Design a protein around this ligand. Structure first.
Ligand SMILES: CCCCCCCCOCCOCCOCCOCCO
Ligand SMILES: CCCCCCCCOCCOCCOCCOCCO
Ligand SMILES: [Ca+2]
Ligand SMILES: [Ca+2]
Ligand SMILES: [Fe+2]
Length: 675
């Protein structure tokens, strides 16, 4: 008839509560009356953990549900008070001479109401058929689906959350007040610096290449100074296709596209007389970076001046024996001919540099619209929203995935509110603008596939499993492995058979919703619409976790490093590509690069998005203990120590590198997409 009730309250700002709190214990034999927890004093302040003794009049049998009621204090003749939001971490029941029942919560009880919690043992739908529990899950998902709905944002995009402003979001999916203030103080300080130098207000060109170094009095990193030092070197231009901002396009080439008419003469130069184009295509030493998806893209206006975008192709040569990757030829158009010369490293200094810079402009547009926004933000939001809608709090797959959604709905809502709207940085300072970004996302959504999101298949598909110096691959594959091993352990704990995967109705609705709302029911994407085997579930969940953590970390962390020296990543171009050779100059080169205000507005935004503001939850670190069972908790431990070992490999590796690759070091990977 006695229970001890132990309650943990959150540490965040505002976590604690004035309000009175009572719990009803529901069991197989019946439900108890509400039981007070107010005890003596302000028991529910931030960071508190405190015990209460409740006596149950009637026995309840096996405990099934904990109902938590919250209500503001009540004054005689004056009514209640304003509700005081409470962040509850978890409850622990301890019956007479029995073990502990632990009820993970980790949510906000804003205002007055009641919250129903199952014990912490993860339960697939078929795992406990008690009707009281089936009702609770069913009611929870109905409530979630009303809370968190879909809207169509643009034609041909993935659908997104049906909310207009960050103000309208539930506490449970909002930035913490600490992370939010850290964010606005950074952005505020940075905008102030950049504005008071008049650089956000200079229309017109940079005065010289020297003047563009002024960006280093704004912000400095060693990676970014390296780009100033080495930007003109062919080996650094090429190395950034493997370890820079956008390391996902390079692919081995046995057959040159017919629209890229490279000749033997054009490459005898770099290749030596001991070989031939056809001989190197066959040897597997030639690689292609194809920016064709940009062809004919709508372009923007900046300070009333039309801007330009190319859609180029770059041939690259892997020299033997850990030698450098080297560019061989660049065509800046998808349609060859006399007005789209094929530029070579042997051309005049500024012809070749101008050609390389247009490719670097193309990486800017490709990376930010597709690799960053669509693949690392929109797809994680779909995964997140589907999870909220289809997987209930007690489901092992919710327990597993929820840390990897943190703040994702918040940050995408913010982008839709303040980033991709008129007057903001996209519209005022990029070459392709809002419309070009949407065009790119619409095109990509029509040829996107599962293999690009699964890193081992992506590496295999692109024929880049052996190319040396590819640290995005080296480190990403180790991480992929660690996540895959973690997910496979967790699946094996709770799903005994392929039949049990199919029989999971909630799991099947979750995949289906992702396929429909996120991938627009396109069977050409190859993304599963159902999951029939344990093996396929493991692969699919690994893809979600990897995409939400390491994938976004890999393509977000080098943004500022890559763009601080603007010729290394011009966000726009102001003259069309050259239509013949022998015309490029330094003066002409700076005249093609973007105006000062657009340069700085973009760097300011890339600096703020490169860095996690506020506090970090690095990959594998799970302070909200949704898993309360020994087995998953061992699996977490194994995942954490494997990441730490990968991190030691990365520092040892990086020790003897002039340009270390840090974007996939696990401590610096966030669990979710949050910036
Ligand atoms: C971290 C402060 C956040 C303040 C937000 C808006 C600030 C308005 O302008 C002041 C920020 O400018 C900082 C630039 O540094 C000049 C101040 O002194 C720097 C040497 O300590
Ligand atoms: C002064 C502009 C600072 C930016 C503040 C708003 C950031 C909120 O959105 C971030 C989430 O969006 C991520 C998508 O990738 C961003 C692509 O934009 C880069 C073009 O500059
Ligand atoms: Ca409060
Ligand atoms: Ca109290
Ligand atoms: Fe991001």
């Amino acid at each position: 008839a006695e229970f001890r009730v132990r309650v943990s309250t959150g540490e965040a700002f505002g976590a604690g509560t004035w309000d009175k709190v009572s719990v009803s214990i529901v069991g197989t034999r019946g439900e108890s009356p509400p039981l007070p927890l107010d005890n003596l004093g302000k028991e529910f302040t931030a960071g508190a953990e405190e015990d209460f003794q409740v006596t149950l009049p009637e026995d309840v049998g096996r405990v099934l549900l904990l109902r938590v009621h919250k209500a503001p204090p009540v004054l005689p003749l004056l009514g209640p008070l304003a509700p005081d939001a409470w962040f509850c971490r978890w409850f622990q029941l301890t019956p007479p001479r029995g073990g502990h029942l632990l009820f993970p919560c980790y949510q906000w009880l804003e205002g007055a109401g009641t919250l129903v919690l199952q014990e912490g043992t993860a339960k697939v739908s078929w795992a406990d058929h008690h009707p009281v529990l089936q009702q609770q899950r069913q009611e929870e998902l109905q409530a979630r689906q009303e809370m968190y709905q879909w809207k169509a944002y643009n034609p041909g995009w993935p659908h997104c959350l049906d909310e207009k402003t960050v103000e309208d979001l539930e506490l449970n999916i909002k930035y913490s007040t600490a992370k939010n203030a850290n964010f606005y103080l950074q952005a505020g300080s940075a905008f102030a610096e950049m504005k008071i130098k008049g650089l956000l207000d200079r229309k017109g060109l940079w005065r010289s290449l020297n003047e563009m170094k002024r960006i280093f009095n704004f912000r400095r990193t060693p990676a970014a100074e390296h780009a100033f030092e080495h930007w003109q070197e062919d080996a650094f231009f090429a190395s950034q296709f493997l370890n820079g901002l956008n390391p996902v396009l390079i692919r081995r080439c046995h057959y040159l596209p017919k629209n890229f008419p490279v000749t033997d003469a054009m490459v005898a130069s770099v290749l030596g007389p001991g070989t031939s184009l056809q001989a190197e295509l066959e040897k597997g030493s030639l690689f292609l970076v194809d920016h064709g998806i940009l062809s004919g893209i709508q372009t923007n206006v900046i300070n009333g001046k039309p801007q330009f975008s190319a859609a180029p192709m770059t041939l690259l040569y892997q020299s033997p024996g850990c030698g450098p990757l080297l560019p061989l030829a660049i065509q800046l158009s998808q349609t060859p001919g006399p007005n789209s010369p094929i530029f070579l490293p042997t051309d005049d200094k500024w012809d070749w540099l101008l050609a390389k810079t247009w490719v670097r402009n193309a990486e800017f547009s490709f990376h930010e619209a597709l690799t960053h926004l669509l693949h690392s933000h929109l797809l994680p939001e779909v995964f997140t929203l589907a999870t909220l809608r289809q997987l209930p709090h007690c489901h092992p797959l919710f327990k597993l995935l929820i840390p990897h959604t943190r703040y994702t709905l918040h940050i995408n809502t913010l982008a839709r509110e303040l980033l991709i709207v008129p007057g903001q940085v996209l519209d005022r300072s990029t070459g392709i603008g809002i419309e070009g970004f949407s065009e790119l996302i619409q095109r990509n959504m029509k040829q996107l596939n599962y293999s690009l999101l699964c890193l081992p298949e992506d590496i295999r598909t692109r024929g880049v499993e052996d190319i040396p110096g590819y640290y995005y691959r080296d480190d990403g594959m180790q991480i992929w492995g660690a996540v895959e091993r973690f997910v496979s352990e967790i699946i094996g704990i709770y799903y005994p058979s392929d039949e049990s995967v199919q029989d999971d109705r909630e799991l099947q609705a979750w995949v289906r919703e992702i396929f429909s709302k996120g991938f627009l029911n396109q069977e050409s994407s190859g993304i599963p619409s159902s999951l029939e085997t344990r093996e396929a579930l493991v692969q699919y969940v690994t893809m979600v976790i990897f995409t939400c953590s390491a994938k976004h970390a890999a393509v977000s962390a080098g943004q500022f490093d890559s763009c601080a020296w603007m010729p290394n990543l011009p966000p726009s171009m102001q003259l069309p590509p050259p239509t013949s050779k022998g015309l490029a100059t330094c003066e002409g080169f700076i005249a093609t690069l973007p105006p000062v205000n657009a340069t700085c507005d973009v760097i300011l935004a890339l600096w703020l998005l490169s860095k996690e503001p506020g506090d970090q939850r690095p990959l594998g670190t799970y302070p909200d203990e949704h898993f309360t069972e020994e087995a998953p908790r061992r699996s977490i431990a194994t995942f954490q120590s494997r990441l730490a070992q990968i991190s030691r490999g990365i520092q040892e590796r990086n020790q003897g590198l002039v340009l270390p690759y840090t974007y996939l070091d696990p401590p610096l990977i966030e669990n979710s997409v949050s910036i």
